[PDB]
Amino acid sequence: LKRESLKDEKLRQQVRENSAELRELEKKLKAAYMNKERAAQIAEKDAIKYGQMKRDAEIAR
Amino acid sequence: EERLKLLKEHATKLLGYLPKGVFKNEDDIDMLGEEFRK
Amino acid sequence: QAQNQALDREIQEWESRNSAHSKNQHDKVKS
Amino acid sequence: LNALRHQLGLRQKWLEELQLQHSLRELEIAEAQDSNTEVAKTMR
Amino acid sequence: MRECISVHVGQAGVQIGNACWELYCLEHGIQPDGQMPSDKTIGGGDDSFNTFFSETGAGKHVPRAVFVDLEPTVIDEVRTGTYRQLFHPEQLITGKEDAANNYARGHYTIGKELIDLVLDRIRKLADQCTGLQGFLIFHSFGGGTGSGFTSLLMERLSVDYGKKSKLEFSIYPAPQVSTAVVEPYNSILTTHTTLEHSDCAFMVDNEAIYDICRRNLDIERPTYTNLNRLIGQIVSSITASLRFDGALNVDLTEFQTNLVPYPRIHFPLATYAPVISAEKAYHEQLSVAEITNACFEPANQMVKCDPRHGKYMACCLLYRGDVVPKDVNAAIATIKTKRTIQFVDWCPTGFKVGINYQPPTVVPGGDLAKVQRAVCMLSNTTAIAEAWARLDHKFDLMYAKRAFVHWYVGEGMEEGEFSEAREDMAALEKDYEEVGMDSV
Amino acid sequence: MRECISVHVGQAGVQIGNACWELYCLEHGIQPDGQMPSFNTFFSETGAGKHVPRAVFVDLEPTVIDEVRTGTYRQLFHPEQLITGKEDAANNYARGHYTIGKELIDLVLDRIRKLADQCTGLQGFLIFHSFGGGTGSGFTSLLMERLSVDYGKKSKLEFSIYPAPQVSTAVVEPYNSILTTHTTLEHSDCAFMVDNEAIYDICRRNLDIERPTYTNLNRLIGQIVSSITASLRFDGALNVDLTEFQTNLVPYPRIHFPLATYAPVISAEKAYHEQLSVAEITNACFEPANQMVKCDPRHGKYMACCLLYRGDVVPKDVNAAIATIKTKRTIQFVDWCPTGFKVGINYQPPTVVPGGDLAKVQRAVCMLSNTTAIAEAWARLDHKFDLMYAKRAFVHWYVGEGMEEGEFSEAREDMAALEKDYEEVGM
Amino acid sequence: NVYMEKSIVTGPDNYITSYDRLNFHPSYRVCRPSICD
Ligand SMILES: Nc1nc2c(ncn2[C@@H]2O[C@H](COP(=O)(O)OP(=O)(O)OP(=O)(O)O)[C@@H](O)[C@H]2O)c(=O)[nH]1
Ligand SMILES: Nc1nc2c(ncn2[C@@H]2O[C@H](COP(=O)(O)OP(=O)(O)OP(=O)(O)O)[C@@H](O)[C@H]2O)c(=O)[nH]1
């Protein structure tokens, strides 16, 4: 059971680091991860600038 | 199937932020998310 | 003031000569 | 006069830029002969 | 793999740019977000975006277009409108203060400041570009930004790249009713910077758009929006073969050795024959036999120059749609045997044909109807010298009293440079006379 | 085994460390607290999941550290490691080296041994400071000298802030910076230098942020101090140890002052429209404006360049990109260095700091080059010294305080050499 | 007598001047660098 479970996982690894088609798709799935965190960074900079616009009105009031 | 496991696990969360050449051969999405709107 | 535009004539000589050097790639691909 | 001396100050500051793009360009153009001749030595 | 660069200069650069880049994004799939639609994403089966649009790895298509002017009051609506995020934000260059509608500000006073910045945005684009098919200059001969900035562009672009084709797009003033007073001073001198520093420069007038809207489009109040839409269509018509395949494909390198015999006569007309409203396309049948006949009609022209007193010396045809080349060959032969259409004796061939398969696309809210086929008509008629003959006299009348010249010479202009601009244009008035003369 | 131990000293130095450990913590997983919800290099394990840091922040005067230990990342730093004092060195190399430093000279030294002994294979040190004030001048030297013998030969790297051209938050700045050179010169290994006037601009020219503070700049300094240590921490292809950087960037002995320039420093809005590829990134670090030191490369000659590429860069495009920059004539490379391009592709895309100022780039580069252009810099700051020293201004304190005027003359001749010694490297 | 010379390019970046040109954000380009045109 340890023998055959090691067999499949690491033959899966052999075709994982050798096949360029997988690496072509592995590159862009992290580029998809980038678009999520970029838009999270887009949404955060509007949220953080909402922090001082109430502060700017507070010190003026 | 190594594509299949990779598209099952690192693609479902990434629904609108997806890149271009990911789902070749339309039937890939039919074995995935239920509405999914490509 | 006199020094200030005295350099400008220098600048303009050194400017239009820069317009002239470009007037005066293949070394890869072709060669 | 201080603003005029300040406005003077940006001018030879800008002149130093022109001499630099000058000297970069003779280095860029005199060499092109050398690379032309170096390839020509292979060519001949 | 073929691809091009489209630079837009001035307010008159960006109003077509707002009315032509919305065409290109609707040409294949592109949203005003730069994102290709989700049911185009499957397999990546489209290379007909690469000519005009680049591609970051994420999936947003960024355009090869730099929008530069000295008026900040017209690009700010692009930075505010629907196409805020399509255009790359450092590729839209704006000055604080306008070019004051005079060439001396746009070429010597302030136009020297922004030129080295926009060369770097050109070699932005050319370095991403494997083989540049050509550039597409967009401006107008109105005033400072449209004529001064582009003419110092023309001087710097011709020396940066050299042996490289480059099309040009500029509207032209009126014979009768112009909208600017100091404008006729510009067109004489900016041609002097265009004769030897431009590959080819099209003939388009906004007044024919007004009259085409009168007779063909059947629309009251011809605005400036639908005016740029037709010239938006016509850049798509000449460059359709860069994106899509055809029976007779034509690249932009084909075009320069196709129309001009002399390196200083690069001045062709450019009309679009199947221009028609929604209601009137319903009754006229549009085969290639009769829409080619509508190309040569003086009413269906582009510049206020009747071609019946001008000799056709070169032409090229670009056909889009379900175009069968045999009925092309029948339609051109009827034009050749037509006596009232005249030619030049040294050019017995005359015409060049180019075929594309895809039909034209119609903007929603637009006046043009979905026509089954389209024809683009491009000729350098010798009758265009009469336009200069009606323009140089307007220049000479204002120069006789030396009016409106203190604004020029104040902003670092020389008085003698206008005289050699006139003296060179005196050769052009003789150049068209010595080309159309019959061989002896 | 692969281990590091910094000595952040001086208001700037410490503030620099603050932002740095923020990214350090995130890179691994350490929560502000210090407990986790391939790191030894910067975080030391303990009993119950607690990865405490491995530095020894100093500061002859209180303040700074006060908040440092009662704010945000409060628990993490070990009560001891944080060493304060009870008064400032008032921008006086004297006070910092021969008057108020002594007091803490041992407390840091002893605390340091602890961190040292604990680890097993410290690849080297990382004294981050700022030539501008006593502690960041006198003490820093006082520490490096004693450390030279108490820890033996060992990468004595240092990333400090060298006085910028026009901008100058200090009047006696010249004296302190020049007086601190005669020390490190022999007791250093690689003074990765970085200014402020340039880091402000780079944060406006490329980051579109005007009115910038010292915090945004701190984050940037970090990204650099991460790529210089990423090859030792996370994994990847070609990798570079602190030992290597030395025998690949420091050509002759005295000549030991490399520059630095992160590359994909782009905002988010701008990135969505602009790709970033091994080529572009590299083809943009050699530019004369992405430099973190106002010293312009063009005005000199590249003697070496270590291009670290913390990112998913493929070990092929990099070779091609380097070949290009090589054949350009513009970027001049001295003949003595026929090659002149160290690489290093770590496979850990750079991390994004919560509410920071940079956009996550799949690929990033930090080329630390050695150009005779730092020569120009030294001379300009040197000029100021000569003037202030000609009228023996601000010497009333400095000298009459705990030091002799001899050093004020020695530092000169020695510096006069460094600049002359740089010139010969070119010829 | 404090005053800052205003830019002409209307962006927050691109601090350009009629006498200080060559002062803007250096370029994306794949093949060559900024200073080797
Ligand atoms: N084709 C087309 N032309 C237009 C449109 N709107 C304005 N124009 C033309 O633009 C011309 C103005 O010329 P320019 O002097 O170049 O105006 P500009 O682009 O702002 O340049 P400057 O005035 O120098 O700043 C007018 O003569 C109009 O005919 C349009 O929407 N489509
Ligand atoms: N990059 C960066 N530089 C800083 C920061 N804070 C201060 N500096 C620079 O460091 C200088 C101030 O540090 P020092 O003058 O050395 O002050 P100090 O280290 O406390 O030394 P003393 O003045 O004797 O107390 C300023 O001139 C800044 O240029 C920062 O947060 N980031």
Ligand SMILES: [Mg+2]
């Ligand atoms: Mg105007």
Ligand SMILES: [Mg+2]
């Ligand atoms: Mg202090």
